[PDB]
Amino acid sequence: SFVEMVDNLRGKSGQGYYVEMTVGSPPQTLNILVDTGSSNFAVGAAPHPFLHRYYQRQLSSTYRDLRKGVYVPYTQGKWEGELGTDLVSIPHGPNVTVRANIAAITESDKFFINGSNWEGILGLAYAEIARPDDSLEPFFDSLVKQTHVPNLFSLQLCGAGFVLASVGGSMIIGGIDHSLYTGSLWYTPIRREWYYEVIIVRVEINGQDLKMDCKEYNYDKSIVDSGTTNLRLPKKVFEAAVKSIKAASSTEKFPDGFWLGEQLVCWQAGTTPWNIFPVISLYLMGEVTNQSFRITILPQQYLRPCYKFAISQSSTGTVMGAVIMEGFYVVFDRARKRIGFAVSACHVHDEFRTAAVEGPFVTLDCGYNI
């Protein structure tokens, strides 16, 4: 039953969402970040100043060494680990246990987050981007293969809403929980199975079309990534977006340090002039060629709590992260190579606007080949 997976996600604002998992025998309890933007099940497996718990392979009777190291450098930092398998469960997920690949993180740099309360990450993307290579079967692949769990999962990230603020959410594994969304689910095709890649065909700020060649929206790719807090946009699209948002909220302006996601902006006790900030609609390619649908997000989503501007620039394509997912119920339909969006039952909104998922919208080549 999906009811037992509701609210199985926790986290601190901007520090990601984690689900509780157990690894090894006896079950070692660990909080594991849900990451649709990577493909490795990787867990702290050695002491670390930010870690209060970690995976201890020696304490596990069911641990099996793969005798193989793995080195994962990335832009912001890195982590190194040792490959092995062990029994893995999600106490508030499917009532199953699977033998999955586990990257035991023995050393890392700027990977773990102070006070985040998670001790590892669950890469939910595809084998193509797994480390060291695509032969290391990702967790969800192992789960589907070893169990009767449907090849599909869905994320309802709720955020906070009215010490870093606490967020809640749900990861429904193996199906769709209809109590988690209202209205209709709209599907955009997963362009290719590595990241969860999609195509954005149009963008609007307060109804105003950005009027850009749609290739710019997906340059060099667009992905859905729960492991990213912000909505991240390619340079050219980011600037056009910020310009439009600066204009719409012209009435009393802010420091450019705020627009850069650096500085924060403060009112007090529900005096925030939400109405001054525009809505943002991303049109995603529909399942039918010349069709599309839009998801519309409020300032309550892209201003995260005093608030920070949760829209930032990208040199690696569009990243639809938490702040865009938080308005909606997102279905990662791997079995049908598509991603569904629907208005979330928990999305934050005032009494004049609401996050929306609306389609269809017709057009009369938006992908960035590879």
Ligand X SMILES: CN1C(=O)[C@@](c2ccccc2)([C@]23C[C@H]4C[C@H](C[C@H](C4)C2)C3)N=C1N
Q: Are 264 and 258 in contact (CB under 8 A)?
A: yes
| 16 near ligand X (CB under 6 A) | yes
By CB under 6 A, residue 121 contacts ligand X: yes
Q: Which of 11, 14, 24, 37 binds ligand X (CB under 6 A)?
A: 37
Q: Which residue has the tokens 């890195």?
A: 78
Candidate segments 34-42, 43-51, 135-143, 270-278, binder of ligand X by CB under 6 A: 34-42
Q: Where in 79-118 is the site for ligand X (CB under 6 A)?
A: 111
DSSP H or E run through 300: helix 299-302
Q: Find the binding residues for ligand X in span 309-348 (CB under 6 A).
A: none
121 vs 279 by CB, closer to ligand X: 121
Closest CA to 34 of 153, 114, 137, 198: 153
Strands 78-89 and 28-35, by their bridges, are: unpaired
Least distance in angstroms from the C-beta of 196 to ligand X: 10
User: d(Cα 262, Cα 264) in Å, to the nearest integer?
Assistant: 7
Residue 344 and residue 342: Cα distance in Å, rounded?
6
> Is the CA virtual torsion 222, 223, 227, 230 positive or negative?
positive
70 versus 240: smaller Cβ distance to ligand X: 70
Element (DSSP H or E) covering residue 349: none
Quick count: other Cβ atoms within 10 Å of Cβ 29? 12
Q: Is the dihedral of CA 95, 101, 107, 109 positive or negative?
A: negative
Residue 140 near ligand X by CB under 6 A: no
For residue 1, count other CB atoms closer than 10 A to its CB.
Answer: 7
CB of 168 to ligand X, least distance (A): 18
Q: Which of 9, 33, 43, 45 binds ligand X (CB under 6 A)?
A: 33
**CB-count burial class (<10 Å; 0-12, 13-18, 19+) for 154:** buried
Q: Which stretch binds ligand X (CB under 6 A): 31-39, 170-178, 236-244, 307-315?
A: 31-39
Size of the site for ligand X (CB under 6 A): 13
**Out of 86, 141, 177, 225, which one is annotated catalytic?**
225
Determine the interface stretch with ligand X among 91-99, 150-158, 224-232, 345-353 (rule: CB under 6 A). 224-232
- Left, alpha or beta for 118 (phi > 0: left; psi -120 to 50: alpha)? beta
Q: How far apart are CA 126 and CA 141, in angstroms?
A: 8
Q: In this structure, which amino acid lies at residue 208? A: Q
Should residue 225 be labelled a site residue for ligand X when binding is judged by CB under 6 A? yes
Q: CB-wise, 24 or 120, nearer to ligand X?
A: 120
Min dist CB 321 to ligand X, Å, is 8
Q: Cβ closer to ligand X: 60 or 228?
A: 228
User: Cβ of residue 38: shortest distance to ligand X, in angstroms?
Assistant: 4
Spatial CA neighbour of 128 closest among 215, 223, 16: 223
Residue 109 designated active-site:
no
Q: Please return the burial class of 187, using the count of CB atoms within 10 Å of its CB with bins 0-12, 13-18 and 19+.
A: buried
Helix and strand totals (H; E) in the chain: 5, 25
The distance of closest approach from Cβ of residue 252 to ligand X in the complex, given in angstroms and rounded to an integer, is 34
The reply to whether 35 belongs to the active site is: yes
Among 168, 227, 317, 367, which residue interacts with ligand X (rule: CB under 6 A)? 227
> Nearer Cβ to ligand X, position 35 or 177?
35
Among 9, 43, 51, 72, binds ligand X (CB under 6 A): 72
Residue 123 CB, shortest distance to ligand X, in Å, is 6
Provide the minimum distance between the beta carbon of 44 and ligand X in the complex, in angstroms, as a whole number: 11
Q: By CB under 6 A, which span of 72-80, 142-150, 256-264, 275-283 interacts with ligand X?
A: 72-80
> Which is nearer to ligand X, 74 or 267 (by Cβ)?
74
CB distance 283 to 209 below 8 Å? no
Which is closer to ligand X, CB of 119 or CB of 216?
A: 119
What is the β-pairing status of strands 28-35 and 120-123? parallel
Catalytic residues, which ones? 35, 225
Chain residues binding ligand X by CB under 6 A are 16, 33, 35, 37-38, 72, 74, 76, 111, 121, 225, 227-228
